[PDB]
Structure 1
Amino acid sequence: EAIVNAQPKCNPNLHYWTTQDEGAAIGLAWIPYFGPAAEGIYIEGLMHNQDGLICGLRQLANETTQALQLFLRATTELRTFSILNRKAIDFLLQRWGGTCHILGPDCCIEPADWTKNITDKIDQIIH
């Protein structure tokens, strides 16, 4: 479903922070005793509105809220860390949760490179 930003304004530029994954730090900076304090673990970046992605993202976050709040209301878990892992599981179950019927629309198996293997093997057998 397409995303229609319907907000009074959009800040088109995204000045963000996050954590560097993985890190590969310099020297002993990876050691908790020697490394940064809580305030110093962040990286930053700046993203512009190419392809409308920033204004689209602001609207996506807005529209996610209802389903995410309803999910939080129904969990008894105090802090939820598992949403992305569960989405990745559901991604796999959507494709591989049943028998894969080759050439079927819900089967992500590309037989083409092997079709040419059998056909070249048959042209040879016929010749």
Structure 2
Amino acid sequence: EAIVNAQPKCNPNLHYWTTQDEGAAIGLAWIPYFGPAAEGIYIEGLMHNQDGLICGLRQLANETTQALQLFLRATTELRTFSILNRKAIDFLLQRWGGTCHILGPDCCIEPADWTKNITDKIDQIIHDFV
């Protein structure tokens, strides 16, 4: 489905915070005893509405809520951390949970370079037939 922003307004810029994902700490700053307190672990960035991604994302978060709330209602876990890992598992099961029938629409196996390897081998025995 496409995402249709249907909110009263949209802030087209996203000034975000998160935790660092790349690069090493400086010196001993990685040691809990020496490093930042809880308030000082955040990085910041700014994203603009290229391709309408920001207004689309605001709408996406809004539309996700019902399914997410129903999921939380049905779980007995007090705090849920496993949603993305389960999505990754389901991604793999969708493609590799059954036998991969080559050339089928649900088998992500490309023998294109494998054809060029065998279609070039036709002249290996049919051309070399002295």
Length-normalised TM-score, structure 1: 0.98
In structure 2, what is the Cα distance between the partners aligned to 1:23 and 1:39?
20
Deviations 1:14-41 (A, max 9, x none): 0000000144100000000000000000
Q: Which residue of 2 aligns with 1:10?
A: 10
Q: Could you tell me how far 1:98 is from its partner in structure 2?
A: 0.2
- The structure carrying a bigger helix percent of its residues is 1
Compute the displacement of 1:122 (Å). 1.3
Q: Which runs of 5+ in 1 are unaligned?
A: none
Structure possessing the higher radius of gyration over alpha carbons: 2
| Partner-residue secondary structure (3-state), 2:18 | strand
- What is the Cα-based RMSD across aligned positions, in Å? 0.7
What secondary structure sits across from 1:126 in the alignment? coil
Unaligned 5+ residue runs, structure 2?
none
Residue identity (%): 100
Distance 1:97 1:27 in 2: 45
Query: Which structure 1 residue ranges, 4+ long, deviate > 4 Å from structure 2?
Result: none
Counterparts of residues 64-103 of structure 1 (less than 5 Å): 64-103=64-103
> How many residues of Structure 1 are paired with residues of Structure 2 in the alignment?
127
